[PDB]
C-alpha cells in the first residue's frame with residue numbers, strides 16, 4: 333500500500349515506528365519529510381554476503397551523507413548471524429577465518445563510512461531470530477540520543 | 490464588534506487551547522524511521 | 537588595616553587572573569561543560585566579596601553606611617543564586633529523559649540569566665525596604681565609661697540583618713538539596729562533592745566568627761578586622777573549591 | 781583509590797579532612813576567649829559535639 337505505522341510503549345515511553353521501504357518511487361523527492369526523526373534503524377543481512385553486500389554498503393553510504401541527516405543518529409542491526417556462522421565454512425568471509433574475525437571486519441567496514449564522527453554516532457548490534465533484549469537496546473540508545481541533543485541545544489555540550 | 494465577533498473569538502480560543510494541548514502531548518512521542526534492503530529480515534526485526 | 541587590605545587586593549588579582557584564563561580558553565570542552573554565563577556571574581560575586589573590605593574601612597558618611605548595608609548581603613546572594621541555577625538546569629536536563637523527547641522549559645543561555653537576576657533582586661528588595669524604614673545616619677557614640685574617645689558609627693547596622701540572613705540561609709539549603717539530587721551525573725557534569733565541602737566550610741567559618749566577635753566588644757577595630765578577614769575567607773573558599 | 785567495601789577508603793578520607801578543619805578552627809578560639817570563661821566552656825562543648833557528629837555522619841551514613 334503506502335507507509336505502514338506501528339505503536340509500542342516501553343518503560344512508560346511512546347515509540348512511533350515508520351516502515352517506508354514499500355514506497356517504490358524516487359527516494360530523493362520525499363526523503364526530506366523525515367528530517368527530525370530521533371533515530372534511523374538500519375538492517376543488514378549477513379547470510380546474504382555472497383555481491384549483495386556491496387549493494388547494502390552503497391545504500392548505507394548514501395544515507396550517512398544525505399544533507400537532511402547531518403546530525404541524526406544511526407542504530408544498526410546485523411541480522412542473519414545464526415546462518416552466517418555456518419556459511420563462513422562453506423564460503424569464507426574473503427568472498428583468519430573465524431566468526432569473531434568476520435564479525436569485526438564487517439563491523440569495521442560499515443562503521444568507517446561516516447565522516448562527521450563528532451556530529452553523529454553509529455550504535456551497532458548483533459541480532460538473532462529470538463532475543464528479548466532488543467527493545468532494551470533501543471531504549472538505552474534512544475535515551476542517550478535524547479540527552480546528547482538536549483545538551484547540545486543549550487550549549488553545554 | 491457585536492456578539493458575532495465575541496462568539497467567534499471565544500470559539501477561536503477553544504480551538505487554540507485544544508491545539509496547544511494536543512501538540513504538547515504529541516511532542517513526547519519518539520519517532521523511529523526504518524530502512525534497509527529487501528529480504529534483509531526487516532519483518533523479523535519488526536515482529 | 538594593612539593586613540585585610542593586602543588580602544583583599546591579592547584576592548581581587550587572583551579573581552581577575554582566573555577570569556582571564558576562562559575567557560582565553562572559552563571554547564574548550566571542559567569550559568563548555570559548565571555554564572559560562574553563570575560562571576561569569578559567580579566570579580563577579582566573588583570579586584564583590586573581596587571589594588567589600590574597602591567599603592568597611594572607609595570613614596562613615598551619609599553614603600558609606602548605605603553601601604555597608606547593601607553590598608554585604610548582595611555579594612553572598614549573587615554567589616549562591618548563581619550556584620543554585622547552574623546546578624538546577626543540569627539536574628532538570630538529566631531528569632527530563634524520564635518524560636521523553638521534550639525540550640525542558642527555560643534552559644536557554646538567556647533564561648538562566650533572568651532567573652539569577654530575579655533571585656538577586658529579591659534580596660535587593662528586602663534591603664531597600666529596610667533601608668527606607670530606617671534612614672542611614674552617621675552618629676557619634678560615646679559610652680557610660682566617660683573615657684570613650686567618642687566613636688563614629690553608622691545609624692542602624694542591625695535593622696536589615698535578620699531578613700537578609702534568613703533569605704541567604706534559604707538559598708543555601710536549596711543549593712545543598714539540588715547538589716544532592718545530581719550526585720549520579722557523569723564526571724564532567726557532577727560537582728556535588730565540591731558544593732558540599734563549600735557549604736560545610738563556610739558554616740564552620742561563621743560559627744568560629746561568633747565567639748571572637750562577642751569577646752572583643754571593646755576595641756571595635758578588632759571587630760572590624762575580624763569581619764573583613766571572615767568575608768575574604770568565604771570568598772576564597774568558594775573560589776578554591778569551584779574553579780581550581 | 782582502593783575499593784574494598786563500597787569504596788569506604790574515600791569516606792575515611794573525607795572524615796579525616798573534615799576533622800582536621802574543625803580542629804584548626806577551634807584551637808585558636810580557646811586562647812582568644814581565655815578572657816571569658818562562660819563562652820570558653822560553651823565553645824568547647826559545641827566543638828566536641830561537632831567533632832563526634834562529623835565522624836558519625838560522614839562514615840556511617
Ligand SMILES: CCCc1cc2c(NCCc3ccc(OCc4nnn[nH]4)cc3)nc(OC)nc2s1
Nearest residue numbers: 604608609612693697700701704705738739742763
Ligand atoms: C551560612 C550563612 C552565611 C552568611 C552570613 C551572612 C551575613 N553575616 C554577617 C552578619 C553581621 C555580623 C556582625 C555585624 O556587626 C559588625 C558591623 N556591621 N556593620 N558595622 N560593623 C554585622 C553583620 N550577612 C549577610 O548579609 C546581611 N549575609 C550572610 S550569608
